[PDB]
Amino acid sequence: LLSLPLVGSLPFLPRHGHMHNNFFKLQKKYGPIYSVRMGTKTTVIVGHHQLAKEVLIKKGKDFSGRPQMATLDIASNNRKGIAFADSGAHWQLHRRLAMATFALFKDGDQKLEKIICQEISTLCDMLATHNGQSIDISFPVFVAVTNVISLICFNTSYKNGDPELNVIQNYNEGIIDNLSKDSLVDLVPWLKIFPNKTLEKLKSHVKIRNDLLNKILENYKEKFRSDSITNMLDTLMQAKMNSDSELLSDNHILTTIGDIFGAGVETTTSVVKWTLAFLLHNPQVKKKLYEEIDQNVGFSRTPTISDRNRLLLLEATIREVLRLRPVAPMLIPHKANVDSSIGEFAVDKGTEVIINLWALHHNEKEWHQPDQFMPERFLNPAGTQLISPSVSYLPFGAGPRSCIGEILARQELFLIMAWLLQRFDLEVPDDGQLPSLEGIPKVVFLIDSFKVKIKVRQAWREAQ
Ligand code: HEM
């Protein structure tokens, strides 16, 4: 007898399990580096911190490109902005500008901390009215960080109950929904194979986004002045003026701002939401954080960046969430700019390269009990200093494409968690429903919405 002719082979079921996991699973069989073919396209998947550090750092510029996806083409207005922009003059300029923007927030009245704290203050005030009730805290958090990013981008914020916030939250939900089904690593190009409305759907969420950004950018051309660089939009216009003409067109500026707005809001919200979930499943850790927040900060004042030097277990909890649930479990896809190599294997010009960050954060030789939420992994055995327990760890990636929002995100997470932990007891709702920790892989790695019982703290009031 005979083997049947094979016309197609995939090593696991599509739309079965999370893909970053299925890829990790195959490491057992094939090693930490291997490739897949779909039509003309080859894709490399990397699942070890050494070979990843080759792609991200050592050969940074070689692998700093982005592949082209019909779905990203829409989200990025034909490859503009930073995130889904390919390497080139376009990317490099807009990346450096945005970065330069961030320094305009290093010291003074527009200290990043002061902008962050104002909003956490509104945010804690709103949340306080719900004393005794179980709420989904998604929207209150989305609001506070929508504000921080808005101030940083434009020097504007939204008053309470402005409907624009609701309009944003909507096309954000609908873009994240139609950007991919599961991860950005779509394996089989299902949307070229059968009739469907997903590009149609995606276009018209992005239309409404682009329309809101167009209003603000034409309504700002007349407020703009050379002697006043205080936000990101200024920085961009300060560049268009001096000069790079092809590079800073209207579309190009809109899209960069659109990336930062998107990225500022959805990543931090998601992580806050994860952190709260892990905290609800871990009442032993939760208790110690209240005890640590009392011993070190008490109730004479609200928490402060300078507190990162003493709220160590809080910073370890955040570190551990960013490990167990990476925001980007497979980063964003890379691409080979020139012919090159990983681990001394050939990788040709144009090949998609994916770092399975999830594998690195779960490597069993690198972590002692990787499947466990254990903020202790990030402390010395006593409890008094933060440690880097493995090199297989890159929540913010690294190299030419590393996260630019990293200082922003770090401070937003630490300050949100600290104000929250000071003022509020956060408990399971009366119906003992805990959130699912499984997650929902999309551009960002999300958690199903859930509810938290929020109460005002006995110790917080017993001091007013
Ligand atoms: C916990 C929150 C965050 C995490 C864990 C995180 C992590 C990451 C990772 C892993 C990447 C991709 C690295 C790669 O593609 O190889 C990335 C890229 C990026 N992030 Fe974040 N990030 C966070 C928050 C933010 C924030 C607050 C912003 C905006 C202020 C932001 C803006 C960006 C942008 C614009 C890129 C694209 C970089 C490029 O293509 O050159 N991120 N981030």
Ligand SMILES: C[C@]12CC[C@H](O)CC1=CC[C@@H]1[C@@H]2CC[C@]2(C)C(c3cccnc3)=CC[C@@H]12
């Ligand atoms: C789709 C979305 C989120 C929904 C918005 O409507 C549009 C948008 C634009 C830029 C994207 C963002 C999600 C987060 C992205 C993908 C991001 C990012 C992703 C992960 C970590 N850090 C940053 C850089 C650009 C960001």
